[PDB]
Enzyme design. Structure first.
Site, PDB file in Angstrom:
ATOM      1  CB  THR A 139      62.291  41.459  92.883  1.00 57.84           C
ATOM      2  OG1 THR A 139      61.741  42.630  93.456  1.00 57.84           O
ATOM      3  CG2 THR A 139      61.219  40.774  92.111  1.00 57.84           C
ATOM      4  CG  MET A 142      61.664  45.254  89.894  1.00 58.23           C
ATOM      5  SD  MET A 142      62.750  43.949  89.203  1.00 58.23           S
ATOM      6  CE  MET A 142      64.344  44.332  89.987  1.00 58.23           C
ATOM      7  CG  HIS A 143      61.966  45.449  96.904  1.00 60.20           C
ATOM      8  ND1 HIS A 143      63.121  45.983  97.440  1.00 60.20           N
ATOM      9  CD2 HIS A 143      62.261  44.155  96.570  1.00 60.20           C
ATOM     10  CE1 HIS A 143      64.085  45.068  97.414  1.00 60.20           C
ATOM     11  NE2 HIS A 143      63.580  43.941  96.914  1.00 60.20           N
ATOM     12  CD  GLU A 144      57.358  51.592  94.731  1.00 61.57           C
ATOM     13  OE1 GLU A 144      57.106  51.626  93.515  1.00 61.57           O
ATOM     14  OE2 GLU A 144      57.584  52.637  95.355  1.00 61.57           O
TER      15      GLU A 144
END
Lengths: 215, 246, 212
Positions: free
Chosen positions: B134, B226-228
């Site tokens: 993302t 969102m990265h996680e």
């Protein structure tokens, strides 16, 4: 369908149709700079409109090549259109300079002229735009073009703005007023109470945030 | 150094990104020199306008391939260093003269400038989602803020490539110029800004960007969230390996 | 490729990851009948149950996208908004009143040059429309579209300066498919995570201001 001037005769009120009123700024001496006379007469014009709730559209305009010229060498107009209960159309057939440009941006609908010059020129004089300006330009023109317009204080032909992309109709000066009347006629097809309620809705956040976010 | 610092007239400071080796991708050097360049400008109250630019056909290319792999592995995050906010935190106006391609985080960095200028021939993309992860770097905030919510959905969801001329046909509020004129234009604009007093420039910018400085940390946080969820999958590593620079 | 219960919506699988939702109540020219409503609800629930789909293309038939509120008396609009994946409103036909507004709830909106769009609700657009129009078209242009309740050709909107791709009707569905293929190259999780983020405030604010 009358036509009168206001106390100092620098604004003329002209009833175009039963439900359309035109407010014409005509301080020829000051090229519609915010003199005390234009200031008083404009307040009177909108006070008159508030007092006679038959209108469905206001068309604010200037004369010849001048819409409004902002504060004078010597020297609240902005909120007049925002607090008017019915749609106001700023037909900027003429130059819009400084507070005169900004004032137009508080109307519900804004029309530019191709040949005219528009500028938020405050910073050209070393000072920051009113907080009114800093609030309304981003809202009407978008954030990125507002940055540029406000920080640099440059001068824009209607045609350059048109080219840069603005949500306003941009027209030959000679057509601005005719287009404004046609548009006012279309607005006047509605019941006056639907126009007022809908405007109430669309501009609530501005009327609510402007007051505070002004100091 | 891969960043060059050029004074123009008295009060304009040009910050020229020139890591030819990585085509102005975020090498560790470019990153460090960029932070340092902006630190030095913030310490200099002579300056009244910054011109941020690249070299030749490149403005900025966003994360290096190794860079994105390390994140994908869990070794580091986009918030380490903090590039995205350089132009937003700078007290004076910054002009992003994007005389060349703006890609991924490099395009987004540039969007935090107060005034952004694109090249008609160059390519621009927020290509984060092409790799399957993302958008980072404040992209989900500054792209709708600069280009409007609708157009930003398309840019951010699809990660497509646009010529400057395409963006100009879609109606963006940035000035779009042939590449050969982007820097000349940036200079004249910068001189025009430099005519104003510094205190007025700083004060007006403070007012225009307060809300961005207020909101941007919370968006960085959402983006890290969102990265996680999206960075650490095998198909993301395949994409960074197979699709980089493609 | 199969119809919904009332037959007035056709679901068409374009590729494995692309689903077309075709509104085709020809009798009512894609007005908001009970049948169109039920069939669209059915369509979006099918899509929810079939997460191989990574993009939705919402469409009408011929020159009609959708004609809005039934001669009769909504919750419809949240169909595309609450869909987990990106929805493309390929408005290849007229968008009238609610039919214009429904398209604006999609993630990507494509207009047709030759088609007519209006938010034309003696009634104030209420909704809904006064919610979603400024957010998708930008405040200033919304004021005009809403106060005047005017009709516009796609080509008019394109000249006034919209963020939507505006195409000849003949190319609209082709462009939509090409875009949908590009969207379908992303992992699903990525797409849904991003969309959840981008439209979260809208999902939040819509219910409140659907009593007001």
């Amino acid at each position: 369908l009358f036509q009168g001037p206001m106390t100092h005769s620098v604004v003329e009120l002209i009833e175009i149709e039963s439900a359309i009123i035109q407010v014409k700024m005509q301080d020829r001496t000051h090229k519609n700079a915010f003199s005390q006379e234009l200031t008083d007469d404009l307040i009177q014009a909108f006070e008159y409109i508030r007092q006679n709730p038959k209108y469905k559209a206001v068309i604010l305009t200037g004369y010849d090549n001048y819409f409004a010229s902002g504060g004078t060498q010597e020297g609240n107009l902005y909120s007049l259109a925002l607090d008017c209960e019915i749609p106001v159309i700023a037909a900027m057939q003429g130059h819009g300079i400084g507070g005169g440009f900004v004032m137009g941006l508080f109307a519900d609908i804004v029309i530019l002229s191709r040949e005219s010059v528009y500028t938020a020129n405050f910073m050209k004089y070393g000072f920051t735009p009113g907080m009114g300006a800093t609030f309304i330009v981003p809202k009407k023109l978008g954030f990125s073009l507002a940055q540029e317009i406000l920080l640099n204080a440059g001068s824009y032909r209607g045609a350059d703005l048109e080219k840069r992309g603005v949500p306003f109709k941009v027209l030959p000066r000679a057509e601005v007023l005719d287009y404004a009347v046609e548009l006012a006629q279309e607005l006047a097809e509605k019941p006056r109470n639907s126009l007022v309620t809908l405007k109430d809705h669309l501009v609530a956040p501005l009327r609510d945030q402007l007051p505070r976010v002004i100091e």
